[PDB]
Amino acid sequence: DGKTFNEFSSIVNIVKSQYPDREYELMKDYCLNLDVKTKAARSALEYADANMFFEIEDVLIDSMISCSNMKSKEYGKVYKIHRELSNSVITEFEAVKRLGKLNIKTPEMNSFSRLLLLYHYLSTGNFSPMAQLIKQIDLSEISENMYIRNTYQTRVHVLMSNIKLNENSLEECREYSKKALESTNILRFQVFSYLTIGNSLLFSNYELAQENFLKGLSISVQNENYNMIFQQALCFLNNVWRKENKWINFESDSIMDLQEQAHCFINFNENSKAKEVLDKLDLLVHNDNELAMHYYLKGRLEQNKACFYSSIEYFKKSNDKFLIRLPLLELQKMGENQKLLELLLLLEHH
Amino acid sequence: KTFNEFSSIVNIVKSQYPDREYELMKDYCLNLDVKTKAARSALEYADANMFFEIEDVLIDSMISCSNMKSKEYGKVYKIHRELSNSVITEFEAVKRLGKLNIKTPEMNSFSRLLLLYHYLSTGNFSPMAQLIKQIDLSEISENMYIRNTYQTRVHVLMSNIKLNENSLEECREYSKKALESTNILRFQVFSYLTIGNSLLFSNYELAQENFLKGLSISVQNENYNMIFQQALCFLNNVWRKENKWINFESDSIMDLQEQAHCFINFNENSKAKEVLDKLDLLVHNDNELAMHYYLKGRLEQNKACFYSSIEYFKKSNDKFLIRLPLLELQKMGENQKLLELLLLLEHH
Secondary structure, X not given: OOOOOOOOHHHHHHHHHHOHHHHHHHHHHHHOOOOOOOHHHHHHHHHHHXXXXXXXXXXXXXXXXXXXXXXXXXXXXXXXXXXXXXXXXXXXXXXXXXXXXXXXXXXXXXXXXXXXXXXXXXXXXXXXXXXXXXXXXXXXXXXXXHHHHHHHHHHHHHHHHHHHHHOOOHXXXXXXXXXXXXXOXXXXXXXXXXXXXXXXOOOOOHHHHHHHHHHHXXXXXXXXXXXXXXXXXXXXXXXXXOOOOOOOOOOOOOHHXXXXXXXXXXXXXXXXXXXXXXXXXXXXXXXXXXXXXXHHHHHHHHXXXXXXXXXXXXXXXXXXXXXXXXXXXXXXXXXXXXXXXXXXXXXXXX | OOOOOXXXXXXXXXXXXXXXXXXXXXXXXXXXXXXXXXXXXXXXXXXXXXXXXXXXXXXXXXXXXOOHHHHHHHHHHHHHHHHHOOOOOHHHHHHHHHHHOOXXXXXXHHHHHHHHHHHHHHOOOOOHHHHHHOOOHHHOOOOHHHHHHHHHHHHHHHHXXXXXXOOHHHHHHHHHHHHHOOOOHHHHHHHHHHHHHHOOOOOHHHHHHHHHHHHHHHOOOHHHHHHHHHHHHXXXXXXXXXXXXXXXXXXXXXXXXXXXXXXXXXXXXXXXXXXXXXXXXOOOOHHHHHHHHHHHHHHHOOHHHHHHHHHHHHHHOOOOOOHHHHHHHHHOOOOHHHHHHHHHOEOO
16 A cells, blocks of 8 residues: 555556546546655656546645645646646746746656647647747656656657648658557547548548548547547548538537538539628638638639638748648639749748 | 057048048058057058058958957958958858957957848848847947947948838938948948938939939049949939940949840840840849849749749848839739738748
């Protein structure tokens, strides 16, 4: 009793093997009984955060911040900052400021302070500073906690894959997602790895794209949020290839769902229904990448080169080098000059 | 025996013997002990006036002398001279400045200035603004002649940077600051040139008036004479007027481009093609190649050439001259949204 394995993966690996249907129930009861001054408790923290077991995470945090082991206290403090940042309790500026005031000592939290900043960049769609930031992480400095060493490596593979996607560097994108999948048994990371591989194939391989989305759908059947994410991914895939789309949510007023309605109606020369849908979208407040997609759809319904120029403008603003291929193709179909196209490819927004 | 500040001689040579400033200063400067502050000032004096006969003699004697401060000055003015005569590449110049382990704030300032001149002359404008903002003349507190001439240098360069940013009022204000700060003919000349050039697309007569003003104080000097001739030549091609300033006896890129530009302004396309066929076979920096494509786009009426011109103006980060292909594209009915998009995007 109170005896811990030297590496947290042992109890996790057992739980996933022998009792996979009770993983939460078993792990919450185990992690909430750890002495929080211990390496198992510090490992349990990262276990809870990777799976978004917020209920387990919050309790570890509050216990660790108040304990006398400075390592646990520091882990608690910066995971606290990540939860309060990922949920808009605090801004980006005061998180960076709070992180600086910690003078972080451990290599683990030096890595995670950067990961939580990268997650906030992924959240907001702000891809430009992500390359620099993710190059500063050096996980080889983590020598004492191999569980955290390994889980963080999965986190970096998944983020690198997402970065490579937006850079339209798709072979690398798929390499990083495959390294992610080989390295993990955490549902969240498998899910986003299958979603990224499939998205990376959106413009090249319909059947392989679909196959990855369905595999991801298979492992998250009873998670309403992941399930919907894969359905939306499949819906977009079928609109890109201009096929019959049985994934469209017609009972939704989210931007993504309505745009897919319009994209399908446009694909099938249902122009009046399509304008009705874009009528609906004009009364909703769009952000940057949503606007990019909005002008692409308007450019196609009106067959108007101007609206595609607007689409390119907003894709460049968000440093989306992947999805920008959609308006660039339609401009070409309208006979736009080759040199112009290359120029639009080469120039960057900054 | 020397004055503590070099401006004591120059101002007396300028007030009393203005018609023989060169003769008298070539004599005085080459009779200074190269180890002293006056010799270090004479080097800046000679370089700012482009009296290379004084400068290159001081550089030699200062590098082989035993005062370490005079030696450092001489070595980095030598790097300026070799780079500006294409004896060494920019990479070799940067490498050599690093190996010098520069100690004075005067040469920390001038080491950045000579890079700035190289960027200007090579059409590589995007690094200039960051680099110039690193210059801090206040650290120069022992040689006031050098502090004050470097300050004039920074005004003229700031004025040029604003010009290439298409920030034309700010351009003219810095050139005025430069004029008010100097009695050195070289800096007066490039100030009138920059003011005139800032008026190229808006005010023909005031542009020409500044060119003729710079000409009025410098015509006797062949180098300066030619610089205002070329400015007036481009002015009159921009405005598509009869052009009495064309140099038909030159094979420099600048002069050949103005021939082609004039031939195109009139309907003389075969003469223009003859000139451009020659220009094809010359190495261009990015800014020069952008002009080349603009002229090709006008001759061939080919939109892709105009897009290539914009491409190379973006690479050089010239926001002023890019107005030439933009207008031609507007005339060809190009979409306004598209042009605004090209304007807001950048090369990098």
